[PDB]
Amino acid sequence: MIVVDIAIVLVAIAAVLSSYRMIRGPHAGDRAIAADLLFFAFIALLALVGVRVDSPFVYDLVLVATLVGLVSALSLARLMSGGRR
């Protein structure tokens, strides 16, 4: 499963770069779009890791993390707008 290790390292590098953007984000909204990209990269890492450590109960998490990487993203928008709708 060398392809899976390559994909894991690539997603980790992408996550590190996007987290650098999170840190040095000029406007508060960049630190939220980086959070969104990182949540999606973390779902990808969940899938790829569940491939590496061969597990049947992966996609439950994948079915839930998407309902989590969204509610935890919209709310960030709700925070950039100062709570105001």
Partner 1 sequence: MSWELVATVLGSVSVLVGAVVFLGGAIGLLRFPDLYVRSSAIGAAAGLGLVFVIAGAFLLHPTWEAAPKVAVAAILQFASSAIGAMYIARAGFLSGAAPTTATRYSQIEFT
Partner 2 sequence: VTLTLALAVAFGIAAISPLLARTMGRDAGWPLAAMLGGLALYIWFAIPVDTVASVEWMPALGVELRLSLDPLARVFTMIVLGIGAVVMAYSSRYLGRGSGHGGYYGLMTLFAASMLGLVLADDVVVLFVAWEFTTLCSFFLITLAGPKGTQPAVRTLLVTVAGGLCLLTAAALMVVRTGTTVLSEILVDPVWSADPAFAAVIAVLIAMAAFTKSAQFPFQAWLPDAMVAATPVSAYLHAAAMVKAGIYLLLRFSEALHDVPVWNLLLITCGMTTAVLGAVFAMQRDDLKELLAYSTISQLGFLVATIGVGTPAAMVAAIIHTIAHALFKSSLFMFVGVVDHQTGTRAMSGLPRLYRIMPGTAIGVGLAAASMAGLPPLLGFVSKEWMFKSMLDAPGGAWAGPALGALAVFAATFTFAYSARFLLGGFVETIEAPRASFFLPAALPAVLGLVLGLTGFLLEPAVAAAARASIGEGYEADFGLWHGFAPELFMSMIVITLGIVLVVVRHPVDRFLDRELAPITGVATVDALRRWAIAGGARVGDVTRTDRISRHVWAVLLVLVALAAVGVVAVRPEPEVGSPVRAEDWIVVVLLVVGTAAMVISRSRLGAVANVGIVGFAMALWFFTLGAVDVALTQLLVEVLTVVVIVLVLQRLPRAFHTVSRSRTLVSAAVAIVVGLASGAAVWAMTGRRELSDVGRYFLDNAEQDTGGINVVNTVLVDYRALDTLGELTVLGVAGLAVILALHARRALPRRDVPLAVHADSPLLSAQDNGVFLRTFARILGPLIVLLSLYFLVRGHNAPGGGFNSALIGGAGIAIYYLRAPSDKAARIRVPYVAVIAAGVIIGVVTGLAGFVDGSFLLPLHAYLGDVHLTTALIFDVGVYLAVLGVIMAAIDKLGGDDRSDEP
Partner 3 sequence: MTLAISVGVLMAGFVFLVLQRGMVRVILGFILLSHAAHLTLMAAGGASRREAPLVSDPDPALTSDGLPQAFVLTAIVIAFAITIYLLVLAVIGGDDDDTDIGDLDPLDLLPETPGGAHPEDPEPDEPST
Rounded CA gap, 55 and 77, in Å? 34
Which letter does DSSP use for residue 66 in this model? Answer: T
Give CA–CA dist 73/35, Å, rounded. 8
How far apart are CB 64 and partner 1 at their closest, in Å? 9
Tell me which residues in 9-68 interact with ligand LMT (CB under 6 A): 9, 12-13
In angstroms, what CA-CA distances link 39 with 36, 42, 84?
Answer: 5, 5, 24
- Contacting positions for partner 1 (CB under 8 A): 1, 3-4, 6-8, 10-11, 13-15, 17-18, 20-21, 27-30, 32-34, 36-37, 40-41, 43-44, 47-48, 50-51, 54, 56, 58-60, 62-63, 66-67, 69-70, 73-74, 76-78, 80-82, 84
